[PDB]
Short mmCIF file of C-alpha atoms in Angstrom, two decimals:
data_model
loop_
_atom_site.label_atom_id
_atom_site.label_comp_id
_atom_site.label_asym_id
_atom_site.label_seq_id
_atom_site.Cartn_x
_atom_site.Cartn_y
_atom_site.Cartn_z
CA UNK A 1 -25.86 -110.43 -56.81
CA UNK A 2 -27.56 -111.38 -53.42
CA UNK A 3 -26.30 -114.73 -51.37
CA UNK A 4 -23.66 -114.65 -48.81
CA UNK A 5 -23.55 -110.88 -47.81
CA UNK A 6 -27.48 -110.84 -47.33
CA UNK A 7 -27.32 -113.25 -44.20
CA UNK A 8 -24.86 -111.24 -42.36
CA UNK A 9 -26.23 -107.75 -43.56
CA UNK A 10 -29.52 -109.85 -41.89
CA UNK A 11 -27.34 -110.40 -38.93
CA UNK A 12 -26.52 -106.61 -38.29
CA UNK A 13 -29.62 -105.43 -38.83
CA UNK A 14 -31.14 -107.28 -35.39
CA UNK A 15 -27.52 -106.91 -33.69
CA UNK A 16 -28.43 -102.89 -34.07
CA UNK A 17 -31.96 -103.26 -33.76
CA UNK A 18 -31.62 -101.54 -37.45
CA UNK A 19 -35.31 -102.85 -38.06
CA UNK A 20 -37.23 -100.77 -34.95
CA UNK A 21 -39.30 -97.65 -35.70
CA UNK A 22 -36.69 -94.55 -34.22
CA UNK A 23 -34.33 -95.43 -37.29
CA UNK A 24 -37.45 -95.51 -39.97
CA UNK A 25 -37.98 -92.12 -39.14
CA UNK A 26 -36.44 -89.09 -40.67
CA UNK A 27 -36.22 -89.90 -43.77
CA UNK A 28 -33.58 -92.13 -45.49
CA UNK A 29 -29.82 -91.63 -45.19
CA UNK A 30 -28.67 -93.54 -48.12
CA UNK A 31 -31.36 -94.91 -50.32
CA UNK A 32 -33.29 -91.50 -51.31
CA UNK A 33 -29.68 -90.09 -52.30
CA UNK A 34 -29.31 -92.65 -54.24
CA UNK A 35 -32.63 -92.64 -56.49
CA UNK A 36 -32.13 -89.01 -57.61
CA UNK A 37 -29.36 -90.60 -60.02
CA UNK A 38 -29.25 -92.69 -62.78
CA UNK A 39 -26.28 -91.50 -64.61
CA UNK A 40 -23.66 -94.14 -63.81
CA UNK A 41 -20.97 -91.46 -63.29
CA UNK A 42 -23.17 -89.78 -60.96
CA UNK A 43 -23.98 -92.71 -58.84
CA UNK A 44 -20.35 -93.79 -58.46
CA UNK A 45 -19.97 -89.90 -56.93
CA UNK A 46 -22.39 -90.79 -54.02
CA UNK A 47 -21.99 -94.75 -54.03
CA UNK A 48 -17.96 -93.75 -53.69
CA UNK A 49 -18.94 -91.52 -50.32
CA UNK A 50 -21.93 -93.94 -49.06
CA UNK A 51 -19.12 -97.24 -49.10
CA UNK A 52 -16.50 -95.31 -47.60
CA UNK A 53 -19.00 -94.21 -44.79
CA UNK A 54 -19.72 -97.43 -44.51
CA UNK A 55 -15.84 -99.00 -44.35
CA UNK A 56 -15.21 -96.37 -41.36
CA UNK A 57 -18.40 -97.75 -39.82
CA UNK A 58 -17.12 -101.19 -40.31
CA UNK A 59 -14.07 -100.02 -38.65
CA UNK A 60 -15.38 -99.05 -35.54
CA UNK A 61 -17.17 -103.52 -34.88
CA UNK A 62 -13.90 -105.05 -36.05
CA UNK A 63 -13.23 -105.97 -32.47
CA UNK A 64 -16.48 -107.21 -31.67
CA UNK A 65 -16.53 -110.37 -31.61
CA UNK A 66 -20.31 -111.37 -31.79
CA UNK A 67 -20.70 -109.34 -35.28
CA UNK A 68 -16.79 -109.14 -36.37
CA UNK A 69 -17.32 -111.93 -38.80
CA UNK A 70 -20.16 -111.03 -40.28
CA UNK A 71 -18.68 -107.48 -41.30
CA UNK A 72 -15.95 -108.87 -42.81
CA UNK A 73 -17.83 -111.07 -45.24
CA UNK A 74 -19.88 -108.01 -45.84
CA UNK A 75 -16.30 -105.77 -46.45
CA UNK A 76 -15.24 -108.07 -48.44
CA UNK A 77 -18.59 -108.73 -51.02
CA UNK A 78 -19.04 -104.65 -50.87
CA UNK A 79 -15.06 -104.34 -51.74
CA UNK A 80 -15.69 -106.76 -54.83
CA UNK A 81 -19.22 -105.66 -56.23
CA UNK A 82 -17.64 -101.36 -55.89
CA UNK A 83 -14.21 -101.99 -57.15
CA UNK A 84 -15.47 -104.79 -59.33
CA UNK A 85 -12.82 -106.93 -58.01
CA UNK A 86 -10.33 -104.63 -59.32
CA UNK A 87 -7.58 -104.62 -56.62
CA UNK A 88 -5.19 -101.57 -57.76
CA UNK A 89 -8.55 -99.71 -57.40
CA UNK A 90 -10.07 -100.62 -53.77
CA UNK A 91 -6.18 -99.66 -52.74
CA UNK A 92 -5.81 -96.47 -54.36
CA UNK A 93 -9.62 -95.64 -53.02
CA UNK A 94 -8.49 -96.63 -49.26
CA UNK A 95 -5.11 -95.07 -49.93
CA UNK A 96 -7.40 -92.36 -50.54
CA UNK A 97 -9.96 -92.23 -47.79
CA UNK A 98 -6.80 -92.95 -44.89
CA UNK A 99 -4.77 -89.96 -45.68
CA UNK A 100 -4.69 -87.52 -42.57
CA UNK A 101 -6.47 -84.31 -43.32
CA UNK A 102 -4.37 -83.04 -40.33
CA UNK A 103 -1.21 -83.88 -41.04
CA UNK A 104 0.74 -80.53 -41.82
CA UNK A 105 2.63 -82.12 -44.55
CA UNK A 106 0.10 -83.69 -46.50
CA UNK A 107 -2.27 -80.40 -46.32
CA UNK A 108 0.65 -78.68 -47.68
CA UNK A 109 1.16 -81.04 -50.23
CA UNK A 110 -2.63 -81.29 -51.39
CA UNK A 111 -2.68 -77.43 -51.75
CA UNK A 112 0.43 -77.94 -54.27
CA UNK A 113 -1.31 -80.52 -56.32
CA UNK A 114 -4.48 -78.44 -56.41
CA UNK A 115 -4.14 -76.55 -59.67
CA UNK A 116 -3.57 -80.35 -61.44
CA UNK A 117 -6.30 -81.62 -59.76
CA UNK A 118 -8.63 -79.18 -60.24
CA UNK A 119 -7.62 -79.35 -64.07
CA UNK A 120 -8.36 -83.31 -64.30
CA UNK A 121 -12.06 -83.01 -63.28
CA UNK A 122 -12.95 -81.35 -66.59
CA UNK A 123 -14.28 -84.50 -68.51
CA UNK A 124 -13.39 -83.30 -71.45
CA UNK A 125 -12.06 -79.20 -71.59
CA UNK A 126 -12.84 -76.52 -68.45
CA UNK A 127 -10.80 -73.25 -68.57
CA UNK A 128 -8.77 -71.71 -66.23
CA UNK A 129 -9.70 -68.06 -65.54
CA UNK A 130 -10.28 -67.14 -61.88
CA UNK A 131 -9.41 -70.16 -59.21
CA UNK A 132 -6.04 -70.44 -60.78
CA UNK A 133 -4.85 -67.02 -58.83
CA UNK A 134 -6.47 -68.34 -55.84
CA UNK A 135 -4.87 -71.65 -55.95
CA UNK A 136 -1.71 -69.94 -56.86
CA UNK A 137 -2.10 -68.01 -53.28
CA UNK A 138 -2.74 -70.59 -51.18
CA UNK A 139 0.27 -72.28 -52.91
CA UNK A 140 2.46 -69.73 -51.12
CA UNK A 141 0.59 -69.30 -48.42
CA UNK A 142 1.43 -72.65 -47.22
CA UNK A 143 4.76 -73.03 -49.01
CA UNK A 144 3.33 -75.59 -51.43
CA UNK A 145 6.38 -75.06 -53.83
CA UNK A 146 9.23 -75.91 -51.44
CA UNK A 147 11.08 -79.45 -51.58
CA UNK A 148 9.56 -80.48 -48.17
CA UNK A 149 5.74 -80.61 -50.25
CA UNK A 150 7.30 -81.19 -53.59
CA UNK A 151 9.67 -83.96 -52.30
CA UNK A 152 8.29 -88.30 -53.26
CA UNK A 153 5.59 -89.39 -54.24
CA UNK A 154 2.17 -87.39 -54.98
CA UNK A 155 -0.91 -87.44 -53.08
CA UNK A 156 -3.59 -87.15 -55.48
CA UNK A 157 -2.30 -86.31 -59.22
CA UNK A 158 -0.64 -89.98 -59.61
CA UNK A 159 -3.62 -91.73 -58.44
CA UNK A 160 -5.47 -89.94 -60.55
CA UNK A 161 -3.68 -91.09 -63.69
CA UNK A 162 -3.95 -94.55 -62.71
CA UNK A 163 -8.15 -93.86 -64.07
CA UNK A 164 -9.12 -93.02 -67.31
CA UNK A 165 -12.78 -94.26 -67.46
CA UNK A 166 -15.09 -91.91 -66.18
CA UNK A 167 -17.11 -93.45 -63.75
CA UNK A 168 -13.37 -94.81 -62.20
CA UNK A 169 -12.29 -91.28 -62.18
CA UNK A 170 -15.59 -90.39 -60.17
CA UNK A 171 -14.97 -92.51 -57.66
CA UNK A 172 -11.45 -91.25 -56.67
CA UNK A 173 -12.28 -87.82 -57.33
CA UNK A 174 -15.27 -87.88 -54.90
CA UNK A 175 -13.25 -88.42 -52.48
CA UNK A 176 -10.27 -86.20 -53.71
CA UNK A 177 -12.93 -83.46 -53.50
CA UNK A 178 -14.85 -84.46 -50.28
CA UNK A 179 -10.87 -84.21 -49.05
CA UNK A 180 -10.21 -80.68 -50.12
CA UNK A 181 -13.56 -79.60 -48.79
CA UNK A 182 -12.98 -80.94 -45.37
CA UNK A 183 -9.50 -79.09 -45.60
CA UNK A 184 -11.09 -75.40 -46.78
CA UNK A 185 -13.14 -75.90 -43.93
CA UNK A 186 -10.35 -75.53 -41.44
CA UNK A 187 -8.80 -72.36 -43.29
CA UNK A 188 -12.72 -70.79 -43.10
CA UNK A 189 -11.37 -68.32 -40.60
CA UNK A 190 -7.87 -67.20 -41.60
CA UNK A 191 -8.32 -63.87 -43.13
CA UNK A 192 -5.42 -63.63 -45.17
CA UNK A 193 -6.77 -66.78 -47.32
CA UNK A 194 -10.43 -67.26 -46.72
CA UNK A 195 -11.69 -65.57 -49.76
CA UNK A 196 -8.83 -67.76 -51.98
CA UNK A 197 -10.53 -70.33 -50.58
CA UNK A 198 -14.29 -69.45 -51.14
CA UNK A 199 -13.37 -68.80 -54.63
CA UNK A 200 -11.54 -72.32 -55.10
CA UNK A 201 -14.48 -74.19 -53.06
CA UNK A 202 -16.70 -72.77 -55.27
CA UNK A 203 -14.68 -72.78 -58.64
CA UNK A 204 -14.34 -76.81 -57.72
CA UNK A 205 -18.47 -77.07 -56.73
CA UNK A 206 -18.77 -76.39 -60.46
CA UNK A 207 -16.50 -77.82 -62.09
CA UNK A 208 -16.92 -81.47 -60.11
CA UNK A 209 -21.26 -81.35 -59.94
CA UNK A 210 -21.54 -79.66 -63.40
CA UNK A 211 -23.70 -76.42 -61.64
CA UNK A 212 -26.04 -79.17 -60.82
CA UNK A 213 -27.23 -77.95 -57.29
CA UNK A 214 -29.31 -81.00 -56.60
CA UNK A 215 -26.09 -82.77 -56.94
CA UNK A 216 -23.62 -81.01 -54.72
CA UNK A 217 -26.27 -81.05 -51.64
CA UNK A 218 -26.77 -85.14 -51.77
CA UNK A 219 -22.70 -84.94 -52.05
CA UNK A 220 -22.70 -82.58 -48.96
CA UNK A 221 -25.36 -84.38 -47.00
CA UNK A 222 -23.75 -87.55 -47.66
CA UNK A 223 -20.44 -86.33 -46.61
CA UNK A 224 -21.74 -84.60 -43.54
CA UNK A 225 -23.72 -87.36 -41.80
CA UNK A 226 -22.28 -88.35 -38.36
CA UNK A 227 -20.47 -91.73 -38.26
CA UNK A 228 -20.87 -91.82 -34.40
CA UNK A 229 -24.78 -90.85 -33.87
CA UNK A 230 -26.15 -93.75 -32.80
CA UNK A 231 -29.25 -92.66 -34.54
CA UNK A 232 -26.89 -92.50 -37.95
CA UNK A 233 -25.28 -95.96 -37.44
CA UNK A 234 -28.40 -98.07 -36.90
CA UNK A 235 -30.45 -96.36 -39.96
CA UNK A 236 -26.97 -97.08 -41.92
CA UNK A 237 -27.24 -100.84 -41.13
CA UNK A 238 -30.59 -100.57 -41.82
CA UNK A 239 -30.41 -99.64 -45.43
CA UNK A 240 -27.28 -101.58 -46.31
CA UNK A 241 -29.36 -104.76 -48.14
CA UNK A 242 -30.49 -102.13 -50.57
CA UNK A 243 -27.76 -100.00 -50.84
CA UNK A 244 -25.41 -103.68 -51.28
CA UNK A 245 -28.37 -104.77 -54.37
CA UNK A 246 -28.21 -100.74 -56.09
CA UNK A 247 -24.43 -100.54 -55.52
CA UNK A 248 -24.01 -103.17 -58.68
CA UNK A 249 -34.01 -106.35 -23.84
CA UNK A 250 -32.90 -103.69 -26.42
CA UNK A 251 -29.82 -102.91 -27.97
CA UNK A 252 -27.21 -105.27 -28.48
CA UNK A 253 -27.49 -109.08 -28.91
CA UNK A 254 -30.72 -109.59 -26.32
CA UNK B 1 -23.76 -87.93 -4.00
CA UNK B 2 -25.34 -91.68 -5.05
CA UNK B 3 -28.93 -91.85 -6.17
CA UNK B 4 -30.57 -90.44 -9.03
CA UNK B 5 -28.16 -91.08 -11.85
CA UNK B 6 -27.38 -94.33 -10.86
CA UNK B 7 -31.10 -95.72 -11.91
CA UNK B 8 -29.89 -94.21 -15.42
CA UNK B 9 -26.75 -95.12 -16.42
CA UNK B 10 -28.09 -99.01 -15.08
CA UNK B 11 -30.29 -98.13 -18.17
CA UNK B 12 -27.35 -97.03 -20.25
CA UNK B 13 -25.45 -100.37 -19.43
CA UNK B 14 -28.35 -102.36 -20.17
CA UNK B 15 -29.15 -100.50 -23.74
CA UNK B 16 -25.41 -101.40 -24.75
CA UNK B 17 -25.27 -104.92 -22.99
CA UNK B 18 -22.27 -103.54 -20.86
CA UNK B 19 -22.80 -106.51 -18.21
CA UNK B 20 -21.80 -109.38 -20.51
CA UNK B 21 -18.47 -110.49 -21.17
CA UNK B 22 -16.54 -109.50 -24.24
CA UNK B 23 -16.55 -106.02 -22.20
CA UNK B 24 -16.02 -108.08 -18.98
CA UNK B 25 -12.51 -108.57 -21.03
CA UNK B 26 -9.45 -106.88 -22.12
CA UNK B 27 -8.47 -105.27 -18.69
CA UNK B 28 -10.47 -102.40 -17.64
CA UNK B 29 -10.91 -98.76 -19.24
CA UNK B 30 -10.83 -96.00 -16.37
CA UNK B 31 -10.83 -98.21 -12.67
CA UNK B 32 -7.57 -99.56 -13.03
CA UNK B 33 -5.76 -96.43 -14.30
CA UNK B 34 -7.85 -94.46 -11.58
CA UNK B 35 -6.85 -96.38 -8.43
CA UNK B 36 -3.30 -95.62 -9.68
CA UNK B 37 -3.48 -92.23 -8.55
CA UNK B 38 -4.42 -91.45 -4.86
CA UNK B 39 -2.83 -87.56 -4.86
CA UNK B 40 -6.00 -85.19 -5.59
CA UNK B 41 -4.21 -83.00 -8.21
CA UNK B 42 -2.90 -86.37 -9.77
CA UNK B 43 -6.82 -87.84 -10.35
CA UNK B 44 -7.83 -84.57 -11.58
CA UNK B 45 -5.52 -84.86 -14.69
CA UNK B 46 -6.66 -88.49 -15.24
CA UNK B 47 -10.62 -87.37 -14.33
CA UNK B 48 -10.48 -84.33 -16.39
CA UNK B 49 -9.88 -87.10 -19.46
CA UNK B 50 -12.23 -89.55 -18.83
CA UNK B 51 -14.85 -87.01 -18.32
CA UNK B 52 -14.27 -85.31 -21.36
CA UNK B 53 -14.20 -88.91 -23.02
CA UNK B 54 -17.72 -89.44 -21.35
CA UNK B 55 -19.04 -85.70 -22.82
CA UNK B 56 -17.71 -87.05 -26.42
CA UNK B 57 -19.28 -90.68 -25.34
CA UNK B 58 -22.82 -89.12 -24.33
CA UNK B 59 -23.18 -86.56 -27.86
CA UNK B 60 -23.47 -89.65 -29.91
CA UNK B 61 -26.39 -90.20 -28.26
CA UNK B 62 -28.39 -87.37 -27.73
CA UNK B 63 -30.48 -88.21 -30.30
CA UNK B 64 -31.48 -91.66 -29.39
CA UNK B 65 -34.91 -91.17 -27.88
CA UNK B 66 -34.86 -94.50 -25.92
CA UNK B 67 -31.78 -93.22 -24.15
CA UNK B 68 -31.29 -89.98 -24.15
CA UNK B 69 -33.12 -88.65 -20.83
CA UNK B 70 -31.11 -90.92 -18.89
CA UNK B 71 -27.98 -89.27 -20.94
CA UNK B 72 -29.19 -85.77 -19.85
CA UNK B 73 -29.43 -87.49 -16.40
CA UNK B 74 -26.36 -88.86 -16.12
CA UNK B 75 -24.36 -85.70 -17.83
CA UNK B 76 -25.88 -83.01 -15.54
CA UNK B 77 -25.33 -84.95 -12.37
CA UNK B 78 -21.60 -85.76 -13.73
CA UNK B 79 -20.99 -82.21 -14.48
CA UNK B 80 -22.27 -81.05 -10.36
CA UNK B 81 -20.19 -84.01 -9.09
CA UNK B 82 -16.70 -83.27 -11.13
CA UNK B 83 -16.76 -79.23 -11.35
CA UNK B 84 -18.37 -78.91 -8.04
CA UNK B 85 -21.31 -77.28 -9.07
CA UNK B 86 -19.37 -74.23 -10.51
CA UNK B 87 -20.54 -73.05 -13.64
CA UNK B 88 -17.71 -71.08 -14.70
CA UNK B 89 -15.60 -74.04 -14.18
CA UNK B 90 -17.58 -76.33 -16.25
CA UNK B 91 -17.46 -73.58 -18.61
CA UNK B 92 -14.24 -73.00 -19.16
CA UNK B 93 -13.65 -76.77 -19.06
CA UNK B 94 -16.17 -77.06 -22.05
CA UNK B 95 -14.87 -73.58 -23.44
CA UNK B 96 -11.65 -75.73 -23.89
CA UNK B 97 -12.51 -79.61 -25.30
CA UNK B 98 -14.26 -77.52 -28.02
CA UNK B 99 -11.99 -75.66 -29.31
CA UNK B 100 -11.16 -77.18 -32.83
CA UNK B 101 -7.55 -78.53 -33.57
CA UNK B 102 -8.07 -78.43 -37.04
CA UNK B 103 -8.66 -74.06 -37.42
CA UNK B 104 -5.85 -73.14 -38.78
CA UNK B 105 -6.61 -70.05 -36.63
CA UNK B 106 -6.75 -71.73 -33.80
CA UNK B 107 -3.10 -74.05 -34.25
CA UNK B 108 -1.24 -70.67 -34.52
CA UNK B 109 -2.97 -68.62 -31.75
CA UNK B 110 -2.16 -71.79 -29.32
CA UNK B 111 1.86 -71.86 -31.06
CA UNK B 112 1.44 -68.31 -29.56
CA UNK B 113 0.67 -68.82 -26.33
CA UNK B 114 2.58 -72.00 -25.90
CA UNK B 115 5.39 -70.28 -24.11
CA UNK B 116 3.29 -68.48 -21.69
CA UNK B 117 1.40 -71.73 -20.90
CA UNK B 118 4.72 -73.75 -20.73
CA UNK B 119 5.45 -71.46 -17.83
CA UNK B 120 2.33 -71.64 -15.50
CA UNK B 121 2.92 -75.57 -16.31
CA UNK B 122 4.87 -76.16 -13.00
CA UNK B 123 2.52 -75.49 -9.28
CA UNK B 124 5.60 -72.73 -8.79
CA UNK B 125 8.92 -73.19 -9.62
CA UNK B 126 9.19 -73.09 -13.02
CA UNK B 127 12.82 -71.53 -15.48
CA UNK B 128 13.75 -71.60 -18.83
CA UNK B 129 16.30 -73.10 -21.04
CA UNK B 130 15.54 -76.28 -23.29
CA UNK B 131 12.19 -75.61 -24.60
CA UNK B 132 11.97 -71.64 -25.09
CA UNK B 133 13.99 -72.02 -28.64
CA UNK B 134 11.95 -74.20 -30.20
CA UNK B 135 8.70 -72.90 -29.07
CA UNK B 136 10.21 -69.55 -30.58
CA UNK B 137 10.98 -71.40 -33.85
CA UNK B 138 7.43 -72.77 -33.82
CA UNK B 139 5.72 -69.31 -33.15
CA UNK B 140 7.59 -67.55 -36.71
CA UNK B 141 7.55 -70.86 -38.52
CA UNK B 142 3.46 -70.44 -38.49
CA UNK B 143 3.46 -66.49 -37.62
CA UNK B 144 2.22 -66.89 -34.29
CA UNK B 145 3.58 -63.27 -33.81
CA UNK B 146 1.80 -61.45 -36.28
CA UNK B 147 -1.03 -59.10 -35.11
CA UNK B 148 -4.00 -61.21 -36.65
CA UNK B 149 -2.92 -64.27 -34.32
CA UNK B 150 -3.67 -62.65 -30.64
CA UNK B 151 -7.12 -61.33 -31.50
CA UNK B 152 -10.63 -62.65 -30.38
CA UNK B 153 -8.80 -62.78 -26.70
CA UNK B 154 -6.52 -65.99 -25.60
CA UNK B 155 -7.01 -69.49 -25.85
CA UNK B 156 -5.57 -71.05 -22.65
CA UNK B 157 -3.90 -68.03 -20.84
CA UNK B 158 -7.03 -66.05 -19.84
CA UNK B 159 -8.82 -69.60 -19.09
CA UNK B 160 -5.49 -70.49 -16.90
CA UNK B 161 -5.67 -67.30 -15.18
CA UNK B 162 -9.30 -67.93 -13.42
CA UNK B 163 -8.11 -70.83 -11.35
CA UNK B 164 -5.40 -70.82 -9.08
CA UNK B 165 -6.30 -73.84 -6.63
CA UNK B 166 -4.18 -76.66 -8.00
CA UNK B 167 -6.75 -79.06 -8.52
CA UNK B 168 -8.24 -76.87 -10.53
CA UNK B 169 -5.97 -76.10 -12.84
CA UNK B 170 -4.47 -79.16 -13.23
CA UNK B 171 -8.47 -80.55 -14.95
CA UNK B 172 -7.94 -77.59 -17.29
CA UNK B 173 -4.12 -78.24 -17.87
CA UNK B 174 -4.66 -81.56 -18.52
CA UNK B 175 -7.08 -81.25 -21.25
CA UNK B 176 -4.76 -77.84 -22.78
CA UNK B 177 -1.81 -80.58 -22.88
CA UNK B 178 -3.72 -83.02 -24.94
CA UNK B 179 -4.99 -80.24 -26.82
CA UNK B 180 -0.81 -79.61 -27.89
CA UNK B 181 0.24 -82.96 -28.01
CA UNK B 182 -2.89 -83.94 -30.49
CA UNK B 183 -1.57 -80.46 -32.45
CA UNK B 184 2.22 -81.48 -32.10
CA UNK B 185 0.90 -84.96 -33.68
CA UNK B 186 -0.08 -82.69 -36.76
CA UNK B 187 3.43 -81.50 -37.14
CA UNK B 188 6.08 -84.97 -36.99
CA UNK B 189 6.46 -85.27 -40.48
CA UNK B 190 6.96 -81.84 -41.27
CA UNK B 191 11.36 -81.90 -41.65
CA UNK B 192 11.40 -77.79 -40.69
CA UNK B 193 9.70 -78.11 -37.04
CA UNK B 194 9.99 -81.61 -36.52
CA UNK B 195 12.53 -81.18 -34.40
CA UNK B 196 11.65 -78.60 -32.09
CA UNK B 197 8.60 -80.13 -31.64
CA UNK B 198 10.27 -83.37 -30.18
CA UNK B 199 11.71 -80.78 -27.83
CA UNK B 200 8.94 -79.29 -26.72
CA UNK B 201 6.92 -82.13 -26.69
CA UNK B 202 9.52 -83.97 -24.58
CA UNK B 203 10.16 -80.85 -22.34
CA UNK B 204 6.34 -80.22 -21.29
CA UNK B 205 6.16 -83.96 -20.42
CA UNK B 206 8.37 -83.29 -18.41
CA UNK B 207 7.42 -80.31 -16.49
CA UNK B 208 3.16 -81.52 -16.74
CA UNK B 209 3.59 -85.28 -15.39
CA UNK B 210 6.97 -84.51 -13.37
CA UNK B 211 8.95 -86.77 -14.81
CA UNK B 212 6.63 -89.16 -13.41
CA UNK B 213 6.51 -91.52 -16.59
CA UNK B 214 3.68 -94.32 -15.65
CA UNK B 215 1.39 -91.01 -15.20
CA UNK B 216 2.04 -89.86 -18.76
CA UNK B 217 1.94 -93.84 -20.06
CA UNK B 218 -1.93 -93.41 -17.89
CA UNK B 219 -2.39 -89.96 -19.27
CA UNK B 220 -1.70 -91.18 -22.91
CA UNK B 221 -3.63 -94.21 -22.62
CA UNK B 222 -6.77 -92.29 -21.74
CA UNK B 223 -6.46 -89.62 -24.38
CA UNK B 224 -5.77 -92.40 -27.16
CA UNK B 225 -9.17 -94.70 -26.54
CA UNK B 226 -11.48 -94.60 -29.28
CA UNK B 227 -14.29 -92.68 -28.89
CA UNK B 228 -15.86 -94.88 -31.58
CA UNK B 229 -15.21 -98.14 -31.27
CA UNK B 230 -18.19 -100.29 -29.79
CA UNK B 231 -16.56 -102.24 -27.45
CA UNK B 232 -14.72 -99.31 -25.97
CA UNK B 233 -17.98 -97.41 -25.81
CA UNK B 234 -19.57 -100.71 -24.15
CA UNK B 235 -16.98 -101.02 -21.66
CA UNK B 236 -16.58 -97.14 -20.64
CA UNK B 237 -21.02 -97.54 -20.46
CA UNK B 238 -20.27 -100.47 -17.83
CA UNK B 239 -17.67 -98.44 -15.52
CA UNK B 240 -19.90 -95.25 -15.71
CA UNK B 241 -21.32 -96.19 -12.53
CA UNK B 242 -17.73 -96.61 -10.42
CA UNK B 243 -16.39 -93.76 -12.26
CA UNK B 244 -19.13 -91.51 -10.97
CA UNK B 245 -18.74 -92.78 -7.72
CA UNK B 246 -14.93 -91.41 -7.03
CA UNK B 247 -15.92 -88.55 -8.47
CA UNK B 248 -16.57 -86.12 -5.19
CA UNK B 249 -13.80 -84.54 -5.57
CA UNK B 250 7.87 -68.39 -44.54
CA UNK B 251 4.35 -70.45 -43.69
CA UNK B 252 1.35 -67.37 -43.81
#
């Protein structure tokens, strides 16, 4: 498609200054990322990471008033051409993307779903073998089997049933997996469970990128980019026309 | 001190458009809540926030060439006018906005000392009572008394110990109390602690602000700003300049 999003997507780019020289340097954030894969179900792993980069940018100029408008009609044509105006989808994505990677209670309860989860990414049949006594660890560790985790309502496992096409399934998973490794991350310390966790991390890597190397780094660089650099922002709003089209005196307002 | 700084962050509010009006709008950021507080040890707790607010503010941009020197600028002159030009200070301050409340390390060796630092709380006269169960729930409930959780030194207590003046400890009090009430946020749906953390929470409200509720309403209101939202960012750019100025001074 290309009409009313591409005005306002115009917009942004001079609001940002998205179109100067210090943000067409460094490479691309977005676009390159996204030309290393054809494979639908690969695209919807990155595309599922790039739009909700994007949505937290979006976030962040609700309340200003000279653009707000103009990111709305773009939330709203991105939100229709991703989910392809399938509603039960673009909530179970943001119901996704706004759970609180802090919050004691829903660590503890993502660490009791693991095992499931880590099940459902085979697309067809992947074995259990090592993680499993990992998983089963950190299960404990945490107290992932008492009725405070295992209480109403399931963080990951029923959203996940709510998707049986593929590429649907890769774009909750994404960010089911982008979830659990910002999570390991904060246990990368802790003795008693680090190497659990190494093991699961990289049990998962597998399992979710198929081995493919190539894969896993445009996930982690995509995951890893800064919402807040400046730098990152404006490049972002540079490259959103494109990513919009594939996905299917300075700064400031003068 | 007013001169060299003050030609950059002029650049600063220009590069953001901080002059106009939509920032002109919604109250202000830091000026209002700062002219609430006259007492020296009382700014401190405010100024120890919105300086670590400005620190978070000025990292975004370090990489933006058209800005950045005058973010060096500005930083370096804010960090001689607010710690006084000590280095340890400045250290320790920085030593303690990046410690990461996410470590799962980290959460249990503060649960740890949270008793300890609940005590050198009050300028002197300081007891026991209300809190002291519940922080003694909260160090077994995440095994804050195991061996593993008081290596690699102390979080807060050796940092509390290298400042007695009270203006001084109150800059690195302030930011060890967000530090717990940003962890305690972590724990208010968990039915076990909840609890106890309410009490403790509550408690070290208490004994930090002195009862003294519009300074923890002021206190609150700085450390829940958005770092990232552009018109915040905008309108903390535009006060940079005033702000400077009165600157001078079992689970596991």
């Amino acid at each position: 498609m290309q009409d009313p999003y591409v005005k306002e997507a115009e917009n942004l780019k001079k609001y940002f200054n998205a179109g100067h020289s210090d943000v067409a340097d460094n490479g691309t954030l977005f676009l390159g990322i996204l030309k290393n894969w054809k494979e639908e179900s690969d695209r919807k792993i990155m595309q599922s990471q790039i739009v909700s980069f994007y949505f937290k940018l979006f976030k962040n100029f609700k309340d200003d008033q000279s653009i707000q408008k103009s990111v709305e009609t773009i939330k709203e044509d991105m939100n229709v051409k991703f989910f392809n105006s399938n509603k039960k989808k673009r909530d179970d994505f943001e119901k996704l993307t706004n759970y609180s990677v802090t919050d004691l209670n829903v660590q503890r309860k993502a660490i009791d779903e693991l095992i499931q989860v880590m099940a459902e990414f085979s697309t067809e049949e992947q074995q259990e073998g090592p993680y499993v006594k990992e998983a089963e660890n950190l299960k404990k560790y945490f107290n992932a089997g008492h009725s405070d985790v295992a209480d109403n309502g399931t963080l990951f496992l029923g959203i996940l049933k709510n998707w049986k096409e593929e590429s649907d399934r890769k774009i909750m998973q994404s960010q089911i997996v982008s979830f659990y490794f910002k999570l390991f991350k904060n246990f990368k310390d802790d003795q008693s469970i680090q190497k659990s966790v190494e093991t699961i991390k990289e049990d998962m890597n597998v399992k979710f990128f198929n081995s493919n190397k190539k894969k896993r780094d445009d996930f982690e660089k995509l995951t890893n980019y800064s919402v807040t650099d400046l730098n990152v922002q404006r490049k972002a709003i540079h490259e959103l026309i494109q990513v919009m089209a594939e996905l299917s005196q300075m700064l400031f307002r003068g």
